[PDB]
Amino acid sequence: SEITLGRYLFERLKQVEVQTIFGLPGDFNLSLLDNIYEVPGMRWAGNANELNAAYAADGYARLKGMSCIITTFGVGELSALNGIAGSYAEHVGVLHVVGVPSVNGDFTVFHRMSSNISETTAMITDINTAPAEIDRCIRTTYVSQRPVYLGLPANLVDLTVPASLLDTPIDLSLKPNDPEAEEEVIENVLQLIKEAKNPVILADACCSRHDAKAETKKLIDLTQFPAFVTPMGKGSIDEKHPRFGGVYVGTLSSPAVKEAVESADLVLSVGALNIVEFHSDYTKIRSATFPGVQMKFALQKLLTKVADAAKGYKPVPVPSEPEHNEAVADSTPLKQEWVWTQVGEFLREGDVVITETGTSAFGINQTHFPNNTYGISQVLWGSIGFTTGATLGAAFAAEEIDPKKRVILFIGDGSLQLTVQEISTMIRWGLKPYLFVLNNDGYTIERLIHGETAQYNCIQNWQHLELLPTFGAKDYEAVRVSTTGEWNKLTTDEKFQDNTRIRLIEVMLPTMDAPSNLVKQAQLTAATNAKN
Amino acid sequence: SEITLGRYLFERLKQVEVQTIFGLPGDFNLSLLDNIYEVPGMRWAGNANELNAAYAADGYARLKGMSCIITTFGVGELSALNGIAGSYAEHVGVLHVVGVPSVLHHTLGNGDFTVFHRMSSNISETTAMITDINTAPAEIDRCIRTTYVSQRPVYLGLPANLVDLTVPASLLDTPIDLSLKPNDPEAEEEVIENVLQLIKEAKNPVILADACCSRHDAKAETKKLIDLTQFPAFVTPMGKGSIDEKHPRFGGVYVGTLSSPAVKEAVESADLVLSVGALLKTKNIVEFHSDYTKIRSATFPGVQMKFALQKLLTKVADAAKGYKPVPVPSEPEHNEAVADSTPLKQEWVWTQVGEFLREGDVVITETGTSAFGINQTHFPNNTYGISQVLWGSIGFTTGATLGAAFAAEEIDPKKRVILFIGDGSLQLTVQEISTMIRWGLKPYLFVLNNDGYTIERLIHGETAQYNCIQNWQHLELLPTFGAKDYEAVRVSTTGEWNKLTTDEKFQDNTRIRLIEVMLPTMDAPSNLVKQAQLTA
């Protein structure tokens, strides 16, 4: 019993819970894409461009575990590179499959360019090794949580392989740690906890996706050591935990936090990216690296002895934050510093919260999350326009995990323009995210760094409210809000709290308005001779 | 008396007739960017994304000789790269300047801060990473010359800590040398002698004007060769506009096996092909390239077409002395009149466009049905075609239109920029309409609404999902992007098309316009349709 190599790839992806395939059709992938619709429960998103398709891929993978984007030779694959690169930077497992031609010259140039931002690459040439090659690409995507480049010649896709190949699972397991090296780490780490009187735990972004979110809460529960998140790790620790201290942003952490960490005699850095760092692939203790000793197992073994070594530690108190705003008049103009606190009131368990590079990125580090809130903020790579695509991907994946689950984007009016057309494919699929667009008449974060009045921080002014209908939506909500009362009236409306249709909320804000600790930040950077 | 290195760059670009700077700000190009407003007659376009900026740089450079796009380290430059690659493939001169960090974010987490430089190196004529103030001016000059003269993208990395260090303003008083080194005499003479020999012995010579005809400054030469020989003269789809189509010896477009039967036969029956501005039946092909000439398998590298043609022209008439001119093919240039209710079909429309165009028009056509349809449209003289046939990146024309319009504005405001784009292609880059609106640019945007990717439907999966698109309201694009002064209309019929395109108000570029051209989903130019049906 015989299937196409095409069908084999999608059946493989299906087995790793990848239901939606991103990308755009072209000459060298059309035959491959047919196979999607021979595997039940699979779909082609039909993206509005390849850059957006890769951002969506990224989004999808963050929620689902990995993703797949298919493009065409040259024109397709090159359009996606900034997306791929961001996935590489932030450790998101995205399989990039390029349909290529049959098997200035140099048909390999694009393959070499993607090698730079890929964990591994394959150019399938051989119908007989192709199944193992696909399998190795998927494993590597999943386990390494980095993009993988798979070139698939258009003449091999509809060549057939034994269906019973699908009956051996792909091995998604980590290879264990060298016990001796691992025992060394544990030994040392345990010594450091025995000495220290005031350790903190720092959760970085890797908690969620590498499943050490569960190990991280147990370390907290067993130590009662205070626990903070980086902007990227925000959501990794449920924020209603007594020992949650808040978001460590370094120089920009609210004062309590800033010193709270800095005052610590031992830092246990988890998912990181007298200090101990647990990374997915290795760990480091003070200066000494320890390659191969993986956080999953390392941390597992640590939990079994952590109580013992922390016997004596007296739980240090932790930063509270002004959970709620004050009442003010209904006519009060919206300000960023009011909005990110108020956004707390609106979030629920199970929400996916996505914040664009800009004010939104800083803003959300001031918002209280309920438990089981999945944060997405691309603080390392920092490519504006990311979040539009990422919203689509996340909304697909959240659809397949749990329909209840709400997708909430905060995007600047600037950032929206780069990737605006991907709203289209949200609509075509009847996805129902909350698109909060921060209209501050341009690039306010840059206005905050250089050229308050420079023309390159000005943007063409769009009619946000008409985006949805223009892109062909027949069942939607678009609304503008400028005041406290307008915000409250919309967001405490129970109708509105139900992810019942795609919504665009245009949030009218001053041009120079910003979260207070971005504000001060540049009050500090513009008065200083510290420079680049 | 000193200027910043940043100012130096924009002053050098002004000297080479680059007035409009493409890109997006960020991170490490901000204080470079300020310098633009310090040079009179310069502007920052303010593109809606880096991909579209690159395509725009491409469009601009095609009209103005060369262009400049500025992006930011990592996020900016990787976004542009598909545009950069098309410019490299189609031999368009874009200088890509990337504001880079001083010599920890938008980083791949790895160590390699040169990684993006290396990726761009594969699609650049040359690169410079600038680190030394002392050679900074000369490096910039070399980058500019290289872009202009090789007509291919150049990568120029500009650390932030150098852009506001000063250099002597007097450096600008030495022009950048943009002339070609004269040919090798020995080589050029062997070329000439040979071409002349072939031309003597040819019974059915033909001239083929490919893509590099206009762009490498050879349109006049090519026309003088037609004039002095009277050989039949055909264009490639890429070359179209290279030869003014009112010339009696103009026989049409050679689209190989998708030609008209007369054109196919007229070209393939030739015993000598004089090909001009190729970027690469019978053996006797002479290729005149920018950089080299090729006669059969024989290559003469560094024998440039500009000068080599100029020499050929001084003897060619003697060689062609005993030529007897063959009558050339022509497409009927007019549709037979029909009822005003006749719904629009591609075959009718590509001929009709013919009745609309006028001298000085820039015609831009997107990959898909338009690129193929445009090949049956008769052009007026001095019509500049843009059709990215080799690289074939859909969406391109949305940026390229912006870029062309800027360049057109700067050359002659009366000049019309006319885009045929598919509904499909428009989605990839729709937003750059915003940038046109911003600058009060006034292209015609013909959007062919055939309800998806028709060229794909024709080749594979007629009704497949991946050939379907979300249906947009094309008439609301303009007001949604903030247009205050514009026109937007839908045409479904011949009468409707005639009504709009013969209208006094329509025929001057007094504002930006969107024409939604409603076409059946499986409708295409007959060449293409006699292909799907034939090679099912």
Ligand SMILES: Cc1ncc(C[n+]2csc(CCOP(=O)(O)OP(=O)(O)O)c2C)c(N)n1
């Ligand atoms: C692809 C890309 N281009 C440019 C930048 C540089 N950049 C960083 S923030 C920003 C402006 C964001 O504007 P907006 O989204 O309107 O946010 P605001 O600060 O106004 O809320 C830009 C242009 C980037 N990070 N990525």
Ligand SMILES: Cc1ncc(C[n+]2csc(CCOP(=O)(O)OP(=O)(O)O)c2C)c(N)n1
């Ligand atoms: C960047 C890029 N993506 C995808 C492709 C593959 N491709 C070529 S033509 C086409 C569809 C064109 O459809 P449309 O613009 O609506 O033109 P039509 O044929 O319908 O006139 C696609 C997807 C490509 N060449 N470049």
Ligand SMILES: [Mg+2]
């Ligand atoms: Mg903004």
Ligand SMILES: [Mg+2]
């Ligand atoms: Mg179409």
